[PDB]
């Protein structure tokens, strides 16, 4: 069970998303990383397979916007993880493993 219950400000300061698994901190990542993840999965699997990725914004996000993006990334990651093909990919899992190492 993936969740993203919280964001943090880190640093050139940026918003980090604290991805949890079964309520336990797994990894911290920024939007740009999840975007790159999505783009690579799209390259590998061809699109009509992935959920829509929460889109780039042209202005710094308000707190409301951050909260919205957090909720959407949370559902996106859940959806990908629950997909047999996507959720089983080495691209998805190696990303998570490395993000976890860097977080830990």
């Amino acid at each position: 069970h993936f969740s993203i219950p919280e964001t943090e400000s880190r640093s050139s300061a940026y918003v980090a998303y604290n991805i949890h698994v079964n309520g336990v901190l797994h990894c911290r990542v920024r939007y740009s990383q999840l975007l790159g993840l999505h783009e690579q999965l799209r390259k590998e699997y061809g699109a009509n397979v992935l959920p829509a990725f929460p889109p780039k914004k042209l202005f710094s996000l308000t707190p409301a916007e951050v909260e919205q993006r957090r909720e959407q990334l949370e559902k996106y990651m859940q959806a990908v993880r629950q997909d047999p093909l996507l959720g089983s990919s080495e691209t998805f899992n190696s990303f998570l493993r490395r993000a976890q190492q860097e977080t830990q």
Side-chain angles (χ1 to χ4, degrees):
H1 189 353
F2 276 64
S3 62
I4 312 188
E6 208 142 25
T7 58
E8 294 170 20
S9 180
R10 297 182 81 93
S11 59
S12 63
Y14 60 91
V15 176
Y17 296 88
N18 298 344
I19 301 179
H20 280 65
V21 177
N22 294 3
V24 171
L25 180 65
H26 184 83
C27 64
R28 186 168 299 118
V29 297
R30 63 193 297 171
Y31 175 83
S32 67
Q33 290 175 287
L34 293 175
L35 178 59
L37 175 60
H38 171 81
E39 292 177 352
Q40 181 61 25
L41 292 168
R42 162 73 182 83
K43 293 171 172 42
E44 293 161 352
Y45 299 106
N48 290 319
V49 161
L50 286 159
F53 189 73
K56 307 173 72 63
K57 300 296 203 168
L58 304 185
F59 302 97
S60 58
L61 279 64
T62 58
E65 280 169 347
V66 169
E67 158 180 56
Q68 181 178 221
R69 178 176 269 182
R70 179 191 67 68
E71 290 164 357
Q72 293 172 320
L73 293 167
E74 173 176 83
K75 291 191 183 66
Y76 172 92
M77 295 295 282
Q78 295 175 341
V80 169
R81 168 66 174 86
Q82 283 179 177
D83 190 91
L85 183 49
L86 294 173
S88 70
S89 71
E90 176 67 11
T91 287
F92 190 64
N93 293 103
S94 71
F95 171 84
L96 291 168
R97 277 195 309 273
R98 180 160 184 164
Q100 177 182 224
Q101 300 171 181
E102 303 205 350
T103 293
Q104 160 180 200

